[PDB]
Design a protein around this ligand. Structure first.
Ligand code: GAL
Ligand code: CL
Ligand code: CL
Ligand code: HG
Ligand code: HG
Ligand code: HG
Ligand code: HG
Ligand code: HG
Length: 272
């Protein structure tokens, strides 16, 4: 459940937070609109796990696996079982054009998977009654470390691993005024990834609905955003600030970017 009566936490023993000792001194851990930026070292997962378990939180994880992308499902699901929201209720939603091609992956208790053929006979209304949060990611990836409730919030975006240190002028936002995804050179907070975003079901549906309409307008105007859905997602998150921003630890490509010291963990990565 979400947004309800929250019971008291039990007695817990952990290191006292130090007011005069910054969490991380090498990175920004909070945005100008007071949304935390999630980096390793900023959170005590035991406290967060307690908070979300006491709420009987259910997380939905959605992926689209079309054509040859169905080949990525086995590794994706197997690693998700080892690193994604372990201990919490998880409902995987696999949208594919090849239902019979979905691998039979063994799931831990309290976790289930639904295969939706695709456009589809699945009404978004179902998400509202089955899960509390929705996490939307790409399938040609693998989890390599912890990805848990620390990411849960009404609406979150993830910093693109190739632009987290870039100035806004270098961001590959759609720069044509004729597009609904247009963002001028003097605007923009960060460059978010289209491949990893989420939040409450309500907020995720609001975002996808907004982008769907924006892309339809562009289509009618004979224009296609430079980076398609990702371009519109950036425009949306610029005008509707996310309540949490995930660091590049959450979507990295070690082949193209290595393992910088600023990244204490590589949690979700592209498959070579
Ligand atoms: O500049 C944006 C682009 O960056 C590339 O590295 C990535 O492969 C694309 O999917 C898109 O995100
Ligand atoms: Cl997605
Ligand atoms: Cl998705
Ligand atoms: Hg800290
Ligand atoms: Hg989604
Ligand atoms: Hg949008
Ligand atoms: Hg869209
Ligand atoms: Hg979008």
């Amino acid at each position: 459940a979400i947004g309800e009566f929250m019971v008291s936490l039990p007695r817990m023993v952990y290191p006292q937070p130090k007011v005069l000792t910054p969490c991380r001194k090498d990175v920004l851990v909070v945005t100008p609109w007071l949304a935390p930026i999630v980096w390793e070292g900023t959170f005590n997962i035991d406290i967060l796990n307690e908070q979300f378990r006491l709420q009987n939180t259910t997380i939905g994880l959605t992926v689209f696996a079309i054509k040859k992308y169905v080949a990525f499902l086995k590794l994706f699901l197997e690693t998700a079982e080892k690193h994604f929201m372990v201990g919490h209720r998880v409902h995987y939603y696999v949208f594919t054009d090849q239902p019979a091609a979905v691998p039979r992956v063994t799931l831990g208790t309290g976790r289930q998977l639904s295969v939706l053929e695709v456009i589809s006979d699945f009404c978004e209304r179902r998400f509202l009654s089955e899960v509390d949060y929705l996490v939307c990611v790409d399938v040609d990836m693998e989890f390599r470390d912890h990805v848990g409730v620390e990411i849960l919030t009404p609406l979150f975006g993830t910093l693109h691993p190739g632009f987290y240190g870039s100035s806004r002028e270098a961001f590959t936002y759609e720069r044509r005024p004729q597009s609904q995804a247009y963002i001028p050179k003097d605007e923009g907070d960060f460059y978010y990834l289209g491949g990893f975003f989420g939040g409450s079901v309500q907020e995720v549906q609001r975002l996808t609905r907004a982008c769907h309409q924006a892309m339809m307008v562009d289509q009618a105007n004979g224009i296609e955003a430079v980076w398609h859905d990702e371009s519109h997602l950036n425009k949306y998150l610029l005008r509707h600030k996310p309540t949490k921003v995930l660091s590049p630890e959450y979507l990295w490509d070690q082949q193209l970017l290595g393992w910088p010291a600023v990244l204490r963990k590589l949690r979700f990565t592209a498959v070579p």
